Design a binder for this molecule. Structure first.
Ligand SMILES: Cc1occc1C(=O)Nc1ccncc1
Ligand SMILES: Cc1occc1C(=O)Nc1ccncc1
Length: 460
């Protein structure tokens, strides 16, 4: 039975509003309702992996697992296996997988981050899960960020805290945060960004939603505008939104947006907003295609509607040769030519590189680079032809061209990373000098760039 080279992944996010769900929630897992929805001809076809993020979840783990498994079994006639479940307060992540994948899944990690301080610590934060699926690392983050239309900068800070402190994936990747540890990272939740229009415009916004005219609302969505200004979610993707705002509804209908200030809201307005979102970030040149992104219309126990997203995602096999794993394959090599980093830092330490990849037996430290001053006031760190030749464990091009090299540039004085990025080995040619590039980030913010050439030798 052959190993897959693609799987489909369901992502759900639902802020349940502290209320039990209704008896039927199958529309959620079928990607049925508003937006980019799934074709009826696929309804009986199970996804490989289901990842369910809830916020304001009132159920026990057992209660919610029973509902989720019985829902999937009704849709698909498959009894899904529980990969992981993790809860922080009322923020929960469940990962379920088809039973045939049980032996393909390993290295399961869970963690949470509590955001805020004193007043603002005790209900917001994130949960996450990571695992290996054959040769492919997968990470999943469900975050409930700070609420309130005038707290976008707090949400941005919450995002930075979560990606700094959430401890998932391979701990040996010590310079790298979760935005670089996975082949595919999915980040979803009640992110709580609002449509930034005046309170006086509430009824105008409602009119627009009834006309399915979202363009002048999306142009004021704080998550889209903060992402365009590189304030948050740098280098993540999101599918185009084609569904109505998912918050704030009167319960037990979807006919009314409950936006007016009330004692129960702290006398805050809740203008219709796309609070509930799914974003992703995959390594360069890995297949990932969003096949649905929408909200359900029939599930009305909460003041939010559930959101679904589905994805095709490229996966690779657990490769064995006569040589690697457990030795190098001297028919393989990775050479970096004429490489330089450009850094936004004022520091004048010397810098060295670390190269990390599961195609190497262990990470590789470079020599220090040569600092020069860039014309427009920046640091240029030149490596020339000094970089160590990397010796992959396997030389077969079917394996090596699917791999990635993570790069950290570190201070010789502190050994702290000033920037992290990723280079694909999915080259146009082998035995050929070819341009490479990655932006460099630290704590998820842009700190510079790495560019040069690569020359890859495979067994072919
Ligand atoms: C198309 C191409 O091939 C090799 C390099 C490039 C390239 O785009 N370089 C670049 C883009 C933007 N800013 C600075 C540099
Ligand atoms: C593809 C490539 O090869 C060498 C450099 C590049 C490149 O794109 N550089 C770049 C892109 C965006 N901003 C700044 C620099």
């Amino acid at each position: 039975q052959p190993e897959p080279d693609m799987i489909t992944i369901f992502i759900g996010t639902w802020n349940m509003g502290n209320a039990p769900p209704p008896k039927k929630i199958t529309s959620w897992f079928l990607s049925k309702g508003q937006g980019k929805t799934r074709d009826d001809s696929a309804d009986y076809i199970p996804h490989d992996i289901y990842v369910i993020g809830t916020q304001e979840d009132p159920l026990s783990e057992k209660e919610w697992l029973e509902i989720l498994k019985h829902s999937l079994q009704e849709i698909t006639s498959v009894t899904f296996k529980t990969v992981a479940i993790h809860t922080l307060w009322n923020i929960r992540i469940v990962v379920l997988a088809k039973p045939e994948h049980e032996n393909r899944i390993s290295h399961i990690c869970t963690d949470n981050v509590k955001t805020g301080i004193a007043n603002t610590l005790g209900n917001k934060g994130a949960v996450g899960v990571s695992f290996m699926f054959n040769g492919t690392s997968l990470g999943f983050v469900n975050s409930h960020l700070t609420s309130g239309s005038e707290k976008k900068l707090r949400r941005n800070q919450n995002y930075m805290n979560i990606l700094r402190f959430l401890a998932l994936g391979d701990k040996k990747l010590s310079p790298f945060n979760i935005t670089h540890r996975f082949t595919h990272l999915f980040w979803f939740g009640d992110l709580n960004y609002r449509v930034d229009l005046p309170t006086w415009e509430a009824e105008t916004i409602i009119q627009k939603i009834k006309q399915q005219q979202y363009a002048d609302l999306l142009s004021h969505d704080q998550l889209l505008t903060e992402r365009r200004e590189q304030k948050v979610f740098l280098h993540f993707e999101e599918e185009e939104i084609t569904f109505a705002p998912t918050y704030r509804f009167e319960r037990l209908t979807r006919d009314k947006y409950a936006y007016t200030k009330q004692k129960a809201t702290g006398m805050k307005y809740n203008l219709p907003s796309w609070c509930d979102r799914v974003l992703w970030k995959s390594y360069p040149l890995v297949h990932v295609v969003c096949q649905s992104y929408g909200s359900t219309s029939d599930i009305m126990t909460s003041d939010h509607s559930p959101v679904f997203a589905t994805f095709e995602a490229g996966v690779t096999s657990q490769f064995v040769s006569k040589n690697g794993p457990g030795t190098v394959d001297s028919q393989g090599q990775i050479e970096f030519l004429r490489c330089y980093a450009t850094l936004k830092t004022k520091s004048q330490t010397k810098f060295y590189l670390e190269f990390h990849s599961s195609c190497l037996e262990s990470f590789v430290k470079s020599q220090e680079g040569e600092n020069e001053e860039g014309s427009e006031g920046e640091l240029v760190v030149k490596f020339g032809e000094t970089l160590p030749k990397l010796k992959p464990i396997i030389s077969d091009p079917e394996y090596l061209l699917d791999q990635h090299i993570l790069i950290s540039i570190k201070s010789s004085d502190s050994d702290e990373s000033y920037g992290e990025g990723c280079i694909a080995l999915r080259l146009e040619a082998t035995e050929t000098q070819l341009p490479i590039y990655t932006p460099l980030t630290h704590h998820g913010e842009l700190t510079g760039h790495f560019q040069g050439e690569i020359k890859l030798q495979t067994s072919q």
